Design a protein around this ligand. Structure first.
Ligand SMILES: Nc1nc2c(ncn2[C@@H]2O[C@H](COP(=O)(O)OP(=O)(O)O)[C@@H](O)[C@H]2O)c(=O)[nH]1
Length: 597
């Protein structure tokens, strides 16, 4: 029986930096060194036996200075952050070690920042791959050549560009508490971060990267890769499938023990534990035995150690991806597994009344990630729950909108908004944010905050009345209409004038409301000091209460005066104050508030 399993390796990195390309290159190095053998096929993963790793490296195996008793490496077929947030029954990432892929030319990017913080919160050891070193200007490319061999073909101009870009890499890594270095320059691999310049498109430096993966995983996970084949199986759901012929099945990576087609398992949902019995296990047939792409699967009796397997069983409809699968041989084992899963749900999901946002995600691991990314930026949270954005979320964000409009929003990560909820989100003006990555969904929300705050200022200026003094012309020649409405040529003495504003005399009597401001054939929305324009005044009649030559003042309220002097002070020019003080001397004869100008 087996002594030690293989480590489960995941691949992280920013989009287009070369995650899937590197995974593709490692499957290619499998066939070139396959050497007359069927390699254990997995559902959702690809195994690389150490016989391939050793012969691919050749004499470079000696760079690790320690024999590798591992049987192989199990690489996850789906890369990225979202795959990494799949967490075990013990809160840890199912990846035993990660590979951070960073484009050497593009450098550090948001998802690089995103993954590094996760790699530290999960305490996961990892290697950094400086990818795309072929786009270095003037680079000598040789297919499937180890990096230490390939660098000897380079000129000083190219090596300089590599050493310079590594320098910026290590600086960013040190800016996150990681001592980074080129791999052949690292002395202590447990106190330092190793960087392997690779070319995932041409296979340059893949030999050195696999040697570091195999070596590090052994010296970091010697003890817990030594699983007993015999123990019950513990796994993590990678995907939930409503298969056409197989019904509801879950794609799972088993990270501990042996799973049997007879086993009773406890499956993690979004709000409950699923106790069911396995009906059938399925794995891919040996690679040569495939003749129809529609029939690639065998019925298996047992899978053990690290294995990707498809589990067909009843009740898996409510199973949640990223949640654990726990085999339970006894009712006590069933009862304990139900506790660990619900304790995991109670620790992530939050339901409160505090004035905050509402967070919805696809899996538990990503829900905890975004909910704490918001806690980094000190954004309160009213609820975080796994599921699609329902109607009753919009109603809860509606109550938050009525309290603080800044937090009456919804943040959904990799989640589709319900049909019955999208109309409610527009009928109540509840902002919904849909995204696939965490950093952008926070930025889009924060960009919305800047928009809304600056709209709040715009609406305030539009609602306040500004001060202004005008004077009617004395000639009967500037009287264009004597009633309904009175249209008279004026000059604005001080401040500014605007339509909808009411006017008063020197004795503080309302004469009418300004219908429109007109200069030449044009219509204006305001007129500032020094402009001679014609204004229409509703309710006023020339000669009745207003007279040519008379000085008129914009009628202001105590609210308008307080707002300008204490909140909009930076918008008042010298003419605006003089207008305001001139109005206050008129309004002081009746209201002694204006004695404070
Ligand atoms: N020149 C060069 N291009 C690369 C390399 N690795 C990946 N690419 C290119 O990068 C593009 C997207 O990379 P991809 O692997 O899909 O990024 P991912 O989303 O992180 O998996 C592809 O068109 C590749 O051709 C490399 O080592 N050199």
């Amino acid at each position: 029986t087996k002594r030690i399993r293989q480590p489960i390796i995941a691949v992280l990195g920013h989009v287009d930096h070369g995650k899937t390309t590197l995974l593709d290159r490692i499957r290619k190095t499998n066939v070139a060194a396959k050497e007359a053998g069927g390699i254990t096929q997995h559902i959702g993963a690809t195994e690389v036996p150490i016989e391939v790793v050793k012969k691919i490296a050749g004499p470079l195996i000696k760079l690790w200075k320690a024999e590798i008793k591992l049987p192989g490496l199990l690489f996850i077929d789906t890369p990225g952050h979202e795959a990494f947030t799949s967490l075990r029954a013990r809160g840890g990432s199912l990846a035993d070690l990660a590979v951070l892929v960073v484009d050497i030319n593009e450098g550090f990017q948001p998802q690089t920042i995103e993954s590094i913080e996760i790699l530290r919160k999960y305490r996961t050891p990892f290697v950094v791959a400086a990818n795309k070193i072929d786009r270095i200007k003037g680079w000598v490319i040789e297919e499937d050549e180890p990096f230490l061999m390939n660098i000897k073909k380079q000129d000083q101009r190219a090596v300089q560009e590599l050493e310079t870009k590594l320098w910026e890499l290590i600086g960013k890594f040190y800016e996150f508490g990681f001592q980074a270095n080129r791999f052949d320059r690292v002395q202590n691999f447990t106190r330092e971060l190793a960087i392997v310049p690779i070319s995932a498109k041409y296979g340059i430096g893949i030999a050195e990267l696999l040697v570091l993966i195999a070596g590090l995983s052994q010296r970091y996970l010697e003890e817990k890769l030594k699983i007993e084949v015999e123990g019950p199986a513990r796994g993590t759901i990678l995907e939930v499938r409503e298969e056409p012929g197989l019904g509801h099945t879950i794609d799972v990576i088993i990270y501990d023990g042996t799973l049997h087609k007879d086993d009773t398992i406890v499956v993690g949902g979004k709000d409950k534990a699923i106790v069911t019995k396995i009906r059938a296990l399925l794995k891919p047939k040996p690679l040569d035995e495939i003749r129809d792409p529609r029939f690639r699967f065998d019925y298996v009796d047992e899978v053990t150690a690290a294995a990707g397997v498809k589990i067909a069983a009843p009740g898996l409809e409510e199973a949640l991806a990223g949640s654990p699968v726990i085999a339970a041989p006894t009712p006590e084992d069933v009862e304990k597994a139900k506790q660990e899963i619900l304790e995991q749900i109670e620790r992530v999901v939050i339901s409160t009344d505090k004035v905050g946002v509402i967070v919805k995600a696809d899996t538990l691991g990503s829900l905890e990630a975004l909910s704490k990314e918001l806690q980094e930026k000190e954004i309160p949270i009213r609820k975080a729950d796994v599921g699609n954005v329902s109607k009753t979320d919009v109603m809860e964000a509606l109550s938050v909108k009525e309290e603080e409009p800044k937090y009456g929003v919804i943040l959904g990560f990799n989640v589709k908004v319900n049909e019955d909820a999208e109309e409610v989100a527009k009928a109540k003006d509840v902002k919904i944010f849909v995204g696939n990555v965490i950093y952008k969904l926070i930025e889009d929300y924060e960009e919305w905050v800047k928009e809304e705050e600056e709209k709040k200022k715009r609406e305030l200026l539009s609602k306040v009345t500004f001060p202004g003094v005008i004077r009617l012309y004395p000639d009967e020649r500037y009287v264009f209409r004597r009633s309904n409405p009175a249209i008279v040529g004026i000059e604005v003495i001080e401040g500014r004038i605007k339509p909808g504003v009411t006017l008063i005399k020197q004795n503080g009597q309302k004469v009418g409301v300004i219908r429109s401001i007109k200069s030449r054939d044009e219509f204006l929305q305001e007129a500032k000091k020094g402009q001679a324009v014609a204004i229409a005044i509703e309710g006023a009649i020339v000669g009745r209460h207003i007279h040519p030559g008379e000085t008129l003042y914009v009628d202001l309220s105590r609210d308008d005066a307080i707002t300008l002097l204490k909140h909009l002070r930076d918008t008042l020019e010298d003419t605006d104050i003089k207008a305001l003080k001139m109005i206050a001397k008129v309004k002081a004869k009746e209201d002694p508030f204006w004695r404070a100008i």
